[PDB]
Design a binder for this molecule. Sequence first.
Ligand code: MET
Ligand code: MET
Ligand code: MET
Ligand code: MET
Ligand code: NA
Ligand code: NA
Ligand code: NA
Ligand code: NA
Ligand code: NA
Ligand code: NA
Ligand code: NA
Ligand code: NA
Ligand SMILES: [Zn+2]
Length: 866
Amino acid sequence: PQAKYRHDYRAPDYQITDIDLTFDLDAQKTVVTAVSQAVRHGASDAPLRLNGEDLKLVSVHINDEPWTAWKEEEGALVISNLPERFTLKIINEISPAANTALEGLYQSGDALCTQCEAEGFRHITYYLDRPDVLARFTTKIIADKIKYPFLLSNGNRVAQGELENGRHWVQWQDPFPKPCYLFALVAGDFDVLRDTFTTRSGREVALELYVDRGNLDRAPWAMTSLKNSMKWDEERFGLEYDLDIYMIVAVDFFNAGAMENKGLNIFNSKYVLARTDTATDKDYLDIERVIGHEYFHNWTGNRVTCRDWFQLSLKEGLTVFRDQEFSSDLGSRAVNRINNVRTMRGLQFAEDASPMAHPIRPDMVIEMNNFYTLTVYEKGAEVIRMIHTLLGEENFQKGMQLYFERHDGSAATCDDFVQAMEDASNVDLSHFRRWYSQSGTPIVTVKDDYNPETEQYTLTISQRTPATPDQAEKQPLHIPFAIELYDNEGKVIPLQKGGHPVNSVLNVTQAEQTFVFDNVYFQPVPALLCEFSAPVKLEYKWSDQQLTFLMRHARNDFSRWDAAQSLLATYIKLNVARHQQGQPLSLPVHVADAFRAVLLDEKIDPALAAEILTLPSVNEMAELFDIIDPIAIAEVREALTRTLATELADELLAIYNANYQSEYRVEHEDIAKRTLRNACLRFLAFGETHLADVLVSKQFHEANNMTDALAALSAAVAAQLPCRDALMQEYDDKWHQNGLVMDKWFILQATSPAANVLETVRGLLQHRSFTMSNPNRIRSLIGAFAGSNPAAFHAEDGSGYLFLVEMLTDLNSRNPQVASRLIEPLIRLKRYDAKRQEKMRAALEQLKGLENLSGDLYEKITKALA
Ligand code: MET
Ligand code: MET
Ligand code: MET
Ligand code: MET
Ligand code: NA
Ligand code: NA
Ligand code: NA
Ligand code: NA
Ligand code: NA
Ligand code: NA
Ligand code: NA
Ligand code: NA
Ligand SMILES: [Zn+2]
């Protein structure tokens, strides 16, 4: 399988303007008739090259003439000797029931549904399956009325009828030209939740949420979130919905999260279905985020789309930025920013240091479904946020407005978006564009000097990005480096130089530079890289007291959290080294006291307190090290938890009890209190065993909501408490029929610290709630083992690797996209010690030799083994 290169992009030889699709729908054999209106742009002797995968070609006509000048080749139908303008008609057959990869047209339970992004439409018919070809679609669907009473596609119903032998049909038209990745089709029998939204200018929108029969009780929050999304995009970005109907279909079988098909979004049911006894507060907030994300794509992705797949971040970085802003505006901005930083520093930094490292606009792709990444998405959004930092909200919105004014109705590039921002704002983003083309995480080193004679504070800042496997050359970036200086009372020192105010966003644009601030009347305590103002590793020599001071005084909630993270880092590193020497945990009393003070501070927002009291995950801990020791990290995190539970036992219990809430409500203040209460419970679980067991069991049995029940269950598992087996069996007996709820239970099984976790995990491959046919189940049991239980995944006997090899041997043939998700932990081998690395390499070499190795795995394996 051959790599494609961004620099090889060229305008298409042919365009398709209009396409009329007919589906004679049947699970075993679907017949597709596609009538396309084509126009030649290239040379008169150029053939039309159509993409197609696993199609049975029945016929080819050009202006109703059965065509002879064509041939099929690998992945293609090549049609020669064409007029300049013509009607192409293809008839072909496909088999949705055989489609286990869930790309193209497939089955989800008894429903038929599609997933076309990135290159799935070519599994449906022979087409120009590239996103710079935009066409107006009309779609006729013919099916058995009893089995498929709802027949849905993009847009509005323009025709409908009934036929003999129990068949019926519906035809749909969507007036907006679209790339085929935005096509969708759904057929099935559903319950439907119906509502309305009226846009600010008065357009009335019918809202329709399709769910499996029996699930209406879990649909209102998603509907509410849709309306919230639509209102917010009007208030924040001045954007209204542009169609008459907004359909969302929740399907149980779906490889990713959800999909922005124009007017007909298709969602993994995990990001739709919630009731207070099935879904946690975090599930509610994730539903909100994802519903919003896909809605936001209506402008950032659909009204302006991507010229080619290398420009993916153009829609994904920007839409992720939008979802974050939506979440942050509606909820706790601090808690949002904190969690997005945790993901950046703990998961995305890992990718940027891996063999799969790529810039946010990639240069080289073998399998495009491998580039829906933390980098494209999350780092992408950090790049959009840097623009926002450099421009300010008002100029950023001017840029958005110019972007849509120039590019509405077309397929644009990352560079087009940057130019709109630069042109609208008059901020020069020439150097800034390097963030699109350079991979790896920059390291920003800061030295400081205070001159008591002149009352000047000097920062010397340097940057470099280490080489990555994809790029041997690196150059300095335009890094917006936000600072704040604090005096001995915790007041902000005005930034100024030579009698003039100085912006607190420093432009760090060279390998090394100095910044001098005047009238610095007291030796400052700096807050550096405020709000994580650029996606960089910060190297500054902090004292413990500078950090504890920030925890007490910093103006931005994020800064308080971040200071706590830097304080902990030092002692995580210390204790990993101690673990390797066989020694007990060591922690200065003044560090425990800083956390004691957070617990007792009444003026701190509980949302913030909770995050300060949530230790870095094992992923975030791993980023602190060059060579990862996954067993030390896991054991250190547990030991640190136990030490704090002991030292802060009284305070923990007091705050746990103070934050009790007898009413459950899905409201942000109430969520914050619960997160604080449950952060306390996590420590309490690891305290004295009998008190722990009682507290955890009681919370699980008395819980009136899944947030509180799961927090208790999860603590019973993490601390291996006596009640654990009974509680886990109770959850299974109650919830086994509900796959989404059992996903949480599979995650706890997968991530259990028990000595025999892998034996238990293999046993669960036969559990009544598990199936290898369902991506969510795979991810919750197998994925979570490999990716979130590094101590067990990286067991010294290599048993973790062998397990994953066996699962991937199945998944490579069944569902290569889920396979490629699950292989990611093996491709990190060079971060591990020699002996682990050798076993991981042997596992990768076994997978490299699979018969019919998928392109998805091949890409990753070849990079990892280089
Ligand atoms: C490759 S699956 C499609 C992902 C979808 N565009 C999203 O943003 O969630
Ligand atoms: C944080 S300002 C102090 C910088 C340095 N320790 C000095 O004494 O100049
Ligand atoms: C929402 S999980 C079920 C929890 C319930 N308190 C029980 O003991 O069964
Ligand atoms: C993670 S709970 C421990 C496993 C449990 N005893 C079981 O067999 O399912
Ligand atoms: Na047709
Ligand atoms: Na077109
Ligand atoms: Na209104
Ligand atoms: Na907010
Ligand atoms: Na968190
Ligand atoms: Na000095
Ligand atoms: Na440091
Ligand atoms: Na099963
Ligand atoms: Zn998206």
